[PDB]
Write a protein that binds this ligand. Structure first.
Ligand SMILES: CN1C(=O)[C@]2(N=C1N)c1cc(-c3cccnc3F)ccc1O[C@H]1CCOC[C@@H]12
Ligand code: NI
Length: 393
């Protein structure tokens, strides 16, 4: 899969993108790789933050579906017109597919100034697609129309501009050069988000000792479209307390722990060893088994080069509170080669050949851990009448 290695780019904190082509003849666009959503949607009209956009009129193969799509979310919205066209990934499999494409005609707080992407590739399942689950997601179309195996894998690798990031999206396979050691699999609990189950959390080898359902309240997901590790409020508070205690030789402002302020040390003097490792134990394929993924402060403290003090190494705390469950975002994923094995309803983790570490500690994937009488750590989201009324033909 050499042709697919190093096919991802981006700016730190602004998401990883892949080059794609849309239409005939092919129009090149940079597309955000998002395992936390399920639409393929591209800028299709001028916008202050877009150097270019999908020109439907320039494509001989474009078909209008005569249907709009409106997608509000917490931080903003995008909307536009549904259609189909021919799509390929130049540094991906040598295939071309007819996929659904949402042509984004209006948006608010969606595009990011300087991120260098013009669209989004939702890699999650039909259940969370807009306007509804009848709009086939891109990967579903790719698998159905071609011989591409139903699996993809992601290796995300962590003064005037933001730091450039790189990585690999391997479509249809696993590239053994992208990881070392064992590849461990956790079940996909349900196919909507890439939902998983966390059974235990440790901070510097110390158990947080919470009811494990708290770790998955109201879900836990693997999301390339979230920068941070995000934790449910109660879990976040417990984690911050534990990380504070370990790093107590340093008194940081409240702003730091809120992710609203950088902390700095003189170049190359960052005291990494005062910050603890964080271990998330994930449910194994076997009953009563788990494995752990362990990340370093090199993952949860994001480097940000300050113009005023380029003399110093400065960092943002990249663990944050959630009210919508655990989000294993780029913070987690940058430690690991992550296999989205849709065919076998499981997600694989192995130590990434590109993860940032020091000579003392490393990001790790370790198991098995067995528990005599393992509890169900899954949370069951209260069923609304809205949701219950939906017919699923
Ligand atoms: C949480 N999350 C988002 O808000 C979302 N992708 C994820 N995963 C998303 C993430 C980003 C995004 C921002 C920074 C870093 N990485 C990213 F990817 C930008 C826009 C965006 O649009 C949302 C449109 C509605 O669906 C979700 C989409
Ligand atoms: Ni019906």
């Amino acid at each position: 899969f050499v042709e697919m290695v190093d096919n991802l780019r981006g700016k730190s904190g602004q998401g990883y993108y892949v080059e794609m082509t849309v239409g005939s003849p092919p129009q090149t666009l940079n597309i955000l790789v998002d395992t936390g959503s399920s639409n393929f949607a591209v800028g299709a009209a001028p916008h202050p933050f877009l150097h270019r956009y999908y020109q439907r009129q320039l494509s001989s193969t474009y078909r209008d579906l005569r249907k709009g799509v409106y997608v509000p979310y917490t931080q903003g919205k995008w909307e536009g017109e549904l259609g189909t066209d021919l799509v390929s990934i130049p540094h991906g499999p040598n295939v071309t597919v007819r996929a659904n494409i949402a042509a984004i005609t209006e948006s608010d707080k969606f595009f990011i100034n300087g991120s260098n992407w013009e669209g989004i590739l939702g890699l999650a399942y039909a259940e969370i697609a807009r306007p509804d689950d009848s709009l086939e997601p891109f990967f579903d179309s790719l698998v159905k129309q071609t011989h591409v195996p139903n699996l993809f894998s992601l290796q995300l690798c962590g003064s005037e501009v933001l730091a450039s990031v790189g990585g690999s999206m391997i479509i249809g396979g696993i590239d053994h050069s992208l990881y070392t050691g064992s590849l461990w699999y956790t079940p996909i609990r349900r196919e909507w988000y890439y939902e998983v189950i966390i059974v235990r959390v440790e901070i510097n080898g110390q158990d947080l000792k919470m009811d494990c359902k708290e770790y998955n309240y109201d879900k836990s997901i693997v999301d390339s479209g979230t920068t941070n590790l995000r934790l449910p409020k109660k879990v976040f508070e417990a984690a911050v307390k534990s990380i504070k205690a370990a790093s107590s030789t340093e008194k940081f402002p409240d702003g730091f722990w809120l992710g609203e302020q950088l902390v700095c040390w003189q170049a190359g003097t960052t005291p990494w060893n005062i910050f603890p490792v964080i271990s998330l134990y994930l449910m194994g394929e076997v009953t009563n088994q788990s494995f752990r993924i362990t990340i370093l402060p090199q993952q949860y403290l994001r480097p940000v080069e300050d113009v005023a003090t380029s003399q110093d190494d400065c960092y943002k705390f990249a663990i944050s509170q959630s009210s919508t469950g655990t989000v294993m975002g780029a913070v987690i994923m940058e430690g690991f080669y992550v296999v989205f094995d849709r065919a076998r309803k499981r997600i694989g983790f192995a130590v990434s050949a590109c993860h940032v570490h020091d000579e003392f500690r490393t990001a790790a994937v370790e198991g098995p851990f067995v528990t005599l009488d393992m509890e169900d750590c899954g949370y069951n989201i209260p069923q609304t009448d809205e949701s219950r009324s939906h017919h699923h033909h």
